[PDB]
Every structure is written in C-alpha cells, then in structure tokens.
C-alpha cells in the first residue's frame, strides 16, 4: 500500500469521525479475515456527532488485515497515550488505513489542536487543499490551496501542515491563512 | 498464512508477471518502461528473475482499476491511497493494483508509476512497510526530484536479501 497522506484539514473534512482515544488492545481478526481491529478507549470526540460515541460507543477501530493492502500498524509503549484518529464509517464502524491521519495528540502543534477543535470545519464545504507532487505543481480552481510542504525537506509534517489552514476569503477564492495558537 | 492466504516468500527464483490492462494517463509503451524498470530494482539485489507474459496467469498480475475492482479493497478515488499489493502466494497473491484516478506519470510531474510499482512489487515478493523514511518500503509517497539518482535504502537490501539471498 502506498499513499499520499492528507493535510490535517482534509483529514478533518473528509473523515466521518475525528475522535481522540487510546489503544487498549493488540490487533485481532474479529468476524472477518479481511479486517483486523484494535480495541480503543475514546476520550474526546471532535467530529461525528451523527454517531454519538460519548465515551464508549466506539470501542473498536477497524483497518485491513495486512499492511500491503493498507492496514494500519500501531506500536506505542504507553497505553494511556492519546491519539487523534480521523476515520470513515463503513456501516457503523470506524475504519482507518495506512494513510488515515493518526498521530499522538501530544505531538500535535498548538495550531493543529486549535484547527481540530475549532477552525478546520470553517474550510470544509468550500475550500479544498491540494497536495503538490512536483515543482510546477498544478494551477487549480481558486478554492484549492496548494499544499507545498514535503517537496521541501521531504516530510509528511511540514510548516503548512503544522501552522496553516485553507480557509475562504472571497467568492471562488480560498487562501492559506495562519491559525496561530 | 495463519488466517489470510499467502506465503512468506516465493518458493522459486524465476517469477513471471503480466500487465493486465493499461492506464490512459500514459502511453502503453511508457507503462512497460516504468513497470520493468521497477522490477529490475529488485533483480539487481537478488538472484530473482522476471519474465513478462501476455496470456495466462502470471504470478504477479499488475493492473489499473478505479473504485470497486474485484478484491475486498476498493480504491478511494483521486488522492490518498494510490495503490495496493498482495504477498507471495497462489491466485490473487503477489498481484499489484493501481489507482487510475491518480495522475500517472513517467516523470517528476505527477505520481511516478515507477516509484509506486517498485514499492508494490516489494510486497509481491514478501516485504512489509518500513519505518525508515528513507526506505522505499516506507508507504508515504515521498516523490524525489531527479529520477536518475534513485537509490535503494540499505534497509530494503538487507530486507529483500534476508529472504531471497544476494545475487550469485
Ligand atoms: Ca498471483
Ligand atoms: Ca486514491
Ligand atoms: Ca488517473
Ligand atoms: Zn505498501
Ligand atoms: Zn485491489
């Protein structure tokens, strides 16, 4: 499985639930050979209130059975550690993959935290962050912000991903705006 | 394996593969270049051989698809997951599928088919994802500028050789 990860904002908009939780158990094949599931302890839920969850409705995060086919692989030492899992809902189940935005909450910049808690929604319905795969990138509609990180330094967690957000500014115009915090 | 089908390594050195269909994105002849150059990357570091076929079932069935495409893992449209592959074994195993919704390019102006095929083939041979960001087997597509200077991470070499040995 190979993939281009999403910018946190796109992670927030396109996901069905943006939960905060701790990984309670090691992967086990549930009622299907196709997916492996992790028992999780959900603390805070930033998105997906059309699925409740409160503190214990979502107790399992699914992902494919094998890495080659996009299964997510979690390996942390402290189980009480908290993560930001942005995932989709196949049926009524939270799914995650190799690309799914999963990072420990404490590693998240103050800006990113603020975006997840309040600002990303603002850019969902209209703006759309587009990841540049080369140097001339690609001019897109005014509502697309050119995610030009990686190309410099070669990383999944650059500046635009740690301090910037793609918010609207004029009809048909979306802009990279800073979310200081 | 224990629950899902598949074997740790191919019990033969001479593998066969087939490029089932083509992506409009790129000229048929260019796909052949990317895939073949991709396979060579692993032949150089092992005693493995790859013979291209055009009919019948090869070990590695390479193909382009969009959304639903047969297996239990539909592709996510443009972006995110660019491709997936299966581990050594019978049938669908070893096969590699590619997301057509992506912009496939033979150059540094799109999603480099070579780079991705090289990665996926590693799975068809029995490799897993690497944590070493410099390793090809790292899942996150890191697109490098000048293609000419592409190099395998020592880690991948130690990885693939610990399975198939180095070239004789
Ligand atoms: Ca096969
Ligand atoms: Ca895709
Ligand atoms: Ca395409
Ligand atoms: Zn992979
Ligand atoms: Zn597939």
Swiss-Prot record, chain A:
A Pfam family it matches: TIMP
Tissue expr: Detected in rheumatoid synovial fluid (at protein level).
Protein name per the record: Metalloproteinase inhibitor 1
Subcellular compartments: Secreted
Originating organism: Homo sapiens
Disulfide bonds: 1-70, 3-99, 13-124, 127-174, 132-137, 145-166
Domain of life: Eukaryota
Swiss-Prot/TrEMBL keywords: Disulfide bond, Glycoprotein, Growth factor, Metal-binding, Metalloenzyme inhibitor, Metalloprotease inhibitor, Phosphoprotein, Protease inhibitor, Secreted, Signal, Zinc
Record family assignment: Belongs to the protease inhibitor I35 (TIMP) family.
Annotated function: Metalloproteinase inhibitor that functions by forming one to one complexes with target metalloproteinases, such as collagenases, and irreversibly inactivates them by binding to their catalytic zinc cofactor. Acts on MMP1, MMP2, MMP3, MMP7, MMP8, MMP9, MMP10, MMP11, MMP12, MMP13 and MMP16. Does not act on MMP14. Also functions as a growth factor that regulates cell differentiation, migration and cell death and activates cellular signaling cascades via CD63 and ITGB1. Plays a role in integrin signaling.
Alphabetical list of CDD domains matching this protein: NTR_TIMP
GO biological process: one example: negative regulation of endopeptidase activity
Site (Involved in metalloproteinase-binding): 34, 135
InterPro entries: Netrin_domain (IPR001134), TIMP (IPR001820), TIMP-like_OB-fold (IPR008993), TIMP_C (IPR027465), TIMP_CS (IPR030490)
UniProt-reported outcome of changing residue 2 to E/G/K/Q/R: Reduced interaction with metalloproteinase
Domain NTR: from-to ranges: 1-124
Subunit record text: Interacts with MMP1, MMP3, MMP10 and MMP13, but has only very low affinity for MMP14. Interacts with CD63; identified in a complex with CD63 and ITGB1.
Residues binding Zn(2+), per UniProt: 1
Glycosylation sites noted in the Swiss-Prot or TrEMBL record: 30, 78
CC per GO annotation: basement membrane; endoplasmic reticulum lumen; extracellular exosome; extracellular matrix; extracellular region; extracellular space; platelet alpha granule lumen
Annotated region described as Involved in metalloproteinase-binding, given as residue ranges: 1-4, 67-68, 156-157
Swiss-Prot record, chain B:
Residues binding Ca(2+) 2: 59, 91, 93, 95
Post-translational modification: Directly cleaved by HTRA2 to produce active form.
Subcellular location, record wording: Secreted, Extracellular space, Extracellular matrix; Nucleus; Cytoplasm
Superkingdom as given in the UniProt entry: Eukaryota
Residues the record lists as binding Ca(2+) 3: 76-77, 79, 81, 99, 102
List of residues binding Zn(2+) 1: 69, 71, 84, 97
Residues given in the record as Ca(2+) 1 binding sites: 25, 100, 102
Positions bound to Zn(2+) 2: 119, 123, 129
Active site: 120
Domain description: The conserved cysteine present in the cysteine-switch motif binds the catalytic zinc ion, thus inhibiting the enzyme. The dissociation of the cysteine from the zinc ion upon the activation-peptide release activates the enzyme.
Annotated disease: Coronary heart disease 6: A multifactorial disease characterized by an imbalance between myocardial functional requirements and the capacity of the coronary vessels to supply sufficient blood flow. Decreased capacity of the coronary vessels is often associated with thickening and loss of elasticity of the coronary arteries.
Family named by the database record: Belongs to the peptidase M10A family.
Function summary: Metalloproteinase with a rather broad substrate specificity that can degrade fibronectin, laminin, gelatins of type I, III, IV, and V; collagens III, IV, X, and IX, and cartilage proteoglycans. Activates different molecules including growth factors, plasminogen or other matrix metalloproteinases such as MMP9. Once released into the extracellular matrix (ECM), the inactive pro-enzyme is activated by the plasmin cascade signaling pathway. Also acts intracellularly.
Protein name, entry field: Stromelysin-1
Organism: Homo sapiens (Human)
GN (gene name): MMP3
From-to range in the entire protein, with total length: 100 to 267 of 477
């Amino acid at each position: 499985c190979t993939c281009v990860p999403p910018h946190p904002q796109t992670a927030f908009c396109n996901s069905d639930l943006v939960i905060r939780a701790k990984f309670v158990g090691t992967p086990e094949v549930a009622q299907t050979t196709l997916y492996q599931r992790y028992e999780i302890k959900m603390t805070k839920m930033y998105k997906g209130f059309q699925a409740l969850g409160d503190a214990a409705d979502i107790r399992f995060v699914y992902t494919p059975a094998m890495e080659s086919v996009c299964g997510y692989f979690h390996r942390s030492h402290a189980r009480s550690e908290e993560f930001l899992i942005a995932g989709k809902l196949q049926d009524g189940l939270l799914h995650i993959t190799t690309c799914s935005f999963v990072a420990p909450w404490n590693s998240l910049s103050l800006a990113q935290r603020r975006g997840f808690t309040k600002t990303y929604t603002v850019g969902c319905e209209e703006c759309t962050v587009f990841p540049c795969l080369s140097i001339p990138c690609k001019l897109q509609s005014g509502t697309h912000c050119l995610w030009t990180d990686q190309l410099l330094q070669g990383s999944e967690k650059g500046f635009q991903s740690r301090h910037l957000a793609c918010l609207p500014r004029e009809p048909g115009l979306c802009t990279w705006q800073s979310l200081r915090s | 394996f224990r629950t899902f089908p598949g074997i740790p390594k191919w019990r033969k050195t001479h593998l066969t593969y087939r490029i089932v269909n083509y992506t409009p994105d790129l000229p048929k002849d260019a796909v052949d270049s990317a895939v073949e150059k991709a396979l060579k990357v692993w032949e150089e570091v092992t005693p493995l051989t790859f013979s291209r076929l055009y009919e019948g079932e090869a070990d590695i069935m390479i193909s382009f698809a969009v959304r639903e495409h047969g297996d239990f893992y539909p592709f996510d449209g443009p972006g995110n997951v660019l491709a997936h592959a299966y581990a050594p074994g019978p049938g669908i195993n070893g096969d590699a599928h590619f997301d057509d919704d992506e912009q496939w390019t033979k150059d540094t102006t799109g999603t480099n088919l070579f780079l991705v095929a090289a990665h996926e083939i590693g799975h068809s041979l029995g490799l897993f994802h690497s944590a070493n960001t410099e390793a090809l087997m790292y899942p996150l597509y890191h697109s490098l500028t000048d293609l000419t200077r592409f190099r395998l991470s020592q880690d991948d070499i130690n990885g693939i050789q610990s399975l198939y040995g180095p070239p004789p």
